[PDB]
Amino acid sequence: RPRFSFSIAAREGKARTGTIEMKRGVIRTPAFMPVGTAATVKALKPETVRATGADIILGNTYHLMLRPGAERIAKLGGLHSFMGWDRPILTDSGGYQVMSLSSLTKQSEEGVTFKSHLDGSRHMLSPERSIEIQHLLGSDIVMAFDECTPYPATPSRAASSMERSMRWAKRSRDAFDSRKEQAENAALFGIQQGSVFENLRQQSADALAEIGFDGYAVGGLAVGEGQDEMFRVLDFSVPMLPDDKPHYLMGVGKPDDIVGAVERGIDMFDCVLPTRSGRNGQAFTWDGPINIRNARFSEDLKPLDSECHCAVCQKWSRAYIHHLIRAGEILGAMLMTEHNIAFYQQLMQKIRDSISEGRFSQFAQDFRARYF
Amino acid sequence: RPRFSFSIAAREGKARTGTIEMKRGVIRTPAFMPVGTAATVKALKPETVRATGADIILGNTYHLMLRPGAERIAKLGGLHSFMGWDRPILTDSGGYQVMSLSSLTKQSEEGVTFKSHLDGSRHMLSPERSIEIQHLLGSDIVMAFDECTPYPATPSRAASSMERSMRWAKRSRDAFDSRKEQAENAALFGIQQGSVFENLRQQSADALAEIGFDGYAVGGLAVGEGQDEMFRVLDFSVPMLPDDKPHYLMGVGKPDDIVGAVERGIDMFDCVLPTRSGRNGQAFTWDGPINIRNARFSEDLKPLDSECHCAVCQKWSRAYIHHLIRAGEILGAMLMTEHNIAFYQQLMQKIRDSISEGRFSQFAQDFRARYF
């Protein structure tokens, strides 16, 4: 396969379905990417992640640069070899989790300095260092290093962050291109900023397209603005991005958010919702999510979801999983997580099929009627 | 297959190798039984437990009578159906864990009254109730309810507990036989007591054989007496039990203890060592155990053990598992546990093969030279 090739096979309104071909594999879009925090998709072997239908997973750069270390992972053969996943891996820049999880973050035009929330050590992440770390990890899809804008944001602060992000996008692009091996085997995605302001989103889109990237992410959303506002921003933002390149909505995962985002032109998603769901006891079903810990499931012999085809729903009952979760058993987490990721992959498959068959709008309507 | 049939195919000294045929499957002996605490073998799907080579697993009655409940499990279809393991399951009586894990234990000739270490509720376990609970669980091999003797024990206290245990063995036998379904589909094992005293062990053996059981366990060992003392007690104790029935050493699992016990006539083992090993970071190898958390494994690309054939050793490095365990990741526990149980099953296979080939003594010698 080529380094990168996105082809749209079908459309319906703003929705698209197709494939991204990369050296390590083919990614069917719209795609949902399970999140692998510390070089592991929580409670699942890579083979199980693949069995659910996942074509690609996401790796958290922040955690990886801290815990095992980027250089160490490189010496060990790369992230793919290290964790046992041989298909594409998209890695975030690490900047977002720096502003969220680390201590004493000192920001500047050069980048960000911070203290680890683990050992209390210090690191200086920048557009160049972030790109380098993702290269050391052996990432297939590299995210440009940006500055995420907090919600709510004033027009002037949103403009300043967006402008810095665009300067950092150019630096990321140049850093990526100067590294022959990375430029030839991996892809680079740019990230649109601008908060909820249309003029800023437009300026960001133009700057990103001017530089040129393999894909474009809509950043700055799912930060506390609510679904209505998120959808409203997507309404005018997605059309600004190049039509022939993938559109990635970062950190968006509720089933209904995904359906609405695809209706607005989004091709890629990622979220910790599926994995963290089977941590507090939340299991997704076509009739809405359920909390398996509730007493009403103690003697329920039915599977998590009545039509889900995952191994968990074929072999175990709600009653058993209810017991496991309440007992704090590891198998409870393993089973809940496998089901949830499988449910998400089945959702993406139903979305892809409906678009290909020109009945996506009907699918969205039916999905919502039953889910709510 | 029959309800129960133990046949010895080969011998070498006191060591034996053969099979126990039961309705749910064949058990190759000497056998190692992974421990399933709360209806789950810690961090492993039943299919993975089977993949390691396990023919039978053990279920903890104490935990089960508390957490989900014996009656509830029966209403749900039995333990096999509940957890997804369709092969034989041996269940302990629950009495041992009552004296270890529960609060305010009031003992008498009728049985034991106690408070749950969970909800703080109260239960009255007796020979009859224990047998009934194991029936409700759908156990294949039922353990007689006894009174474990604390170490060290005086001759008079050891005699009193052993005598009570023998009276309780008769009650267990009668309770088992009066329940047609259980007597016809399951087996009952008696437990020898008597601490470290030969005369008591002899009296216990005679009483047990007089009643008659499908198998005989050597109880009261692995309670703090040390390997030397344990072996010394086994030297004179195992020969006292009926030769044509299985000999089960309860709660014994260190690899070297197993090898020495088989040399003394033991056919069955169980222990939490394998599962708890991959909790603190201990991994078994033919060159002795290693603690994967140690810094020397941070960049070690070799598998846990150089010759182990488990899926873990085929796919992941010590470096990766080291990272997972130190990160507190669930996959770390899953991988360590699978390897350890697989290592134990491979040990049992090497033991069975060496006995069948008349070279077990040489195997024990070679095993120890390299393991220590």
Ligand SMILES: CCCSCc1cc(N)cc2c(=O)[nH]c(N)nc12
């Ligand atoms: C688990 C982390 C992967 S997605 C993180 C994420 C989530 C959301 N909602 C927005 C952003 C953003 O604007 N920039 C970056 N780098 N990341 C974002």
Ligand SMILES: CCCSCc1cc(N)cc2c(=O)[nH]c(N)nc12
């Ligand atoms: C996880 C518990 C299964 S084995 C428990 C055990 C372990 C040891 N070492 C001795 C005994 C005993 O004498 N009686 C009983 N019921 N159980 C014993």
Ligand SMILES: [Zn+2]
């Ligand atoms: Zn399912």
Ligand SMILES: [Zn+2]
């Ligand atoms: Zn192994």
